[PDB]
Amino acid sequence: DREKIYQWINELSSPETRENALLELSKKRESVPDLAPMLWHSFGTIAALLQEIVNIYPSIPPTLTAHQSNRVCNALALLQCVASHPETRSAFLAAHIPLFLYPFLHTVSKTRPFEYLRLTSLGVIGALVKTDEQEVINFLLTTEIIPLCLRIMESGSELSKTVATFILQKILLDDTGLAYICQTYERFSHVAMILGKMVLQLSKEPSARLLKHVVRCYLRLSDNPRAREALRQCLPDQLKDTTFAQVLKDDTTTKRWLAQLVKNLQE
Amino acid sequence: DREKIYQWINELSSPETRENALLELSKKRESVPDLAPMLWHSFGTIAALLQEIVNIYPSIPTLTAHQSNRVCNALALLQCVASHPETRSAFLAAHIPLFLYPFLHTVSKTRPFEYLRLTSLGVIGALVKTDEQEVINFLLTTEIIPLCLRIMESGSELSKTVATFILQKILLDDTGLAYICQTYERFSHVAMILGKMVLQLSKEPSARLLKHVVRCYLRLSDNPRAREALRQCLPDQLKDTTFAQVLKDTTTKRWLAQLVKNLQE
């Protein structure tokens, strides 16, 4: 067991064997809880995973194929293991490794290879914020991810919309993130304008998981005094009538969050 | 004065003001001796510098002279951080060299790319001037040696010189020498590239490059196994009179002679 794993890890550092090792290790990442520190502390291994990432950049005139996307997403999945493990997450963050994925998030092509690439990249950021440490939000605030999230929230695939809104929610929920987002009208209104478009979209094609995150974001913004005052005027009307009444029967948490939002705007 | 420096540092955070702050701060790095800790401990600043690097990656081959000058300003600032004793260790933990390695992989010979590569090399060169063990070990695990060899094989005279200097520093460390001699793939690749550079130096001399190449050979001869292989493969121009008139004026003479000495015994 642990022998065949160390052999695959060693085989990541040669182009002759890397592709097969990426496929095999990504399949076992859940059955190996110490896979992340094994990767991080193995000579040459992180550089080899990053080489898979950088080798995709020339495919960004967008020409990424399904095969290229699947291979690099296997490397991304191993990086996500490192992102989330308690023994490696801090060093991973301090090494700025998520920055290598931002060229992927900047793509707009709608082909299936690029959608899967962005979704998987977003998953790596999702793994970080799910650990709930304040170092993570600081990294996101100082790397300009917020515009990337907002644009994906605006026009991404339904799955990418959800992860990106989830990431913004985690930024908002942090006291420093909320203050950062509300620091200027320009920052606040970039967020509020995208949320309002998403509300309109949701009123025509339901998505309960996306609706919950959007409501949560509005509710958290209303904790900030100036955001609260602006939202009292710009809150989409579909959040105040019965547009979402039907679809919110199951979502008792979200139905409650919306009620709290509507009240907060009045106080 | 000092306040204008802190203002520019703060202006690196926003895309609206970053470009001008990069221009002004790069001009000020030599006269501001504590610039590196100022950059490092300001919120978001190192990240903004890395953003400038990562933003250019899709242009790595349509890079323009303007795009190159801009990122090279950021790179000059990153060199300040690499060279400062207060900040070098954190610089390594920040993995900043890894962001420069895509630049060293480019091959285009247009001036924007040549200046890009030379400036990136200066960052690494500044790192290795200190011989710290953790610096050598970071560069080894992040695969610096293939990138050095690639630049030594195909670069400009100035690029070949820094890349060989960097290889020389890795070789000077026992860990780097042992690593380079650990397999015959790696030793043969290093010896092959150095042999080609000797041929090219015999036809177009360059004292600075020749000194580093001899130093690399001398150091390889400290490894008892790089000795039997080097006895057979050492280029003929390092044994005869080829480089005498260029070595007229001593450090490289002694190194050459000691190399000959070392291979006999």
Q: Give the separation between CA B213 and CA B194, rounded to whole angstroms.
A: 7
Tell me the CATH number of domain A2-267, given options 3.40.50.12780, 1.25.10.10, 3.90.245.10, 1.10.10.520.
1.25.10.10
Report chain B residues whose CB lies below 8 A from the CB of A44: 141-143
Using a 10 angstrom Cβ sphere, with 0-12 exposed, 13-18 middle and 19 or more buried, the burial of residue B66 is exposed
Measured CA to CA in angstroms, residue B184 lies from A43, A131, B8, B110, B233 at distances of 18, 44, 51, 35, 13
* Residue B127 host element (H or E): helix B111-128
List the 126-145 stretch of B: residues with Cβ below 8 A of A: 140-143
- Put simply, whether A107 touches B (Cβ < 8 Å) is no
Q: Both tokens of residue A254? A: 């979200």
Measured CA to CA in angstroms, residue A224 lies from A177, A185, A210, A264 at distances of 11, 12, 22, 10
Nearest CB partner across the interface for B51, out of A54, A95, A143: A143
- Put simply, whether A55 touches B (Cβ < 8 Å) is no
- Put simply, whether A47 touches B (Cβ < 8 Å) is yes
- B58 to A54: CB separation less than 8 angstroms, yes or no: no
Q: Give the separation between CA A42 and CA A39, rounded to whole angstroms.
A: 5
Q: Where are the domains of chain A?
A: 2-267
**The architecture CATH gives domain B2-265:** Alpha Horseshoe (1.25)
Report the 3 state secondary structure along B178-196: HHHCCCHHHHHHHHHHHHH
**Within 10 Å of residue B130's Cβ, how many Cβ atoms?**
14
Residue A143 has, within 13 A of its CA and on its CB side, a CA count of 26
- B44 to A97: CB separation less than 8 angstroms, yes or no: no
Measured CA to CA in angstroms, residue A120 lies from A9, A98, B139, B219 at distances of 21, 12, 29, 46
Chains A, B: CB contacts within 8 A come to: 63
Q: Are A96 and B95 in contact (CB under 8 A)?
A: yes
Q: Are A18 and A48 in contact (CB under 8 A)?
A: yes
Q: Give the separation between CA B215 and CA B165, rounded to whole angstroms.
A: 9
Report chain A residues whose CB lies below 8 A from the CB of B15: 144
The residue among B256, B252, B262, B193 whose CA lies nearest residue B227 is B262
Using a 10 angstrom Cβ sphere, with 0-12 exposed, 13-18 middle and 19 or more buried, the burial of residue B16 is exposed
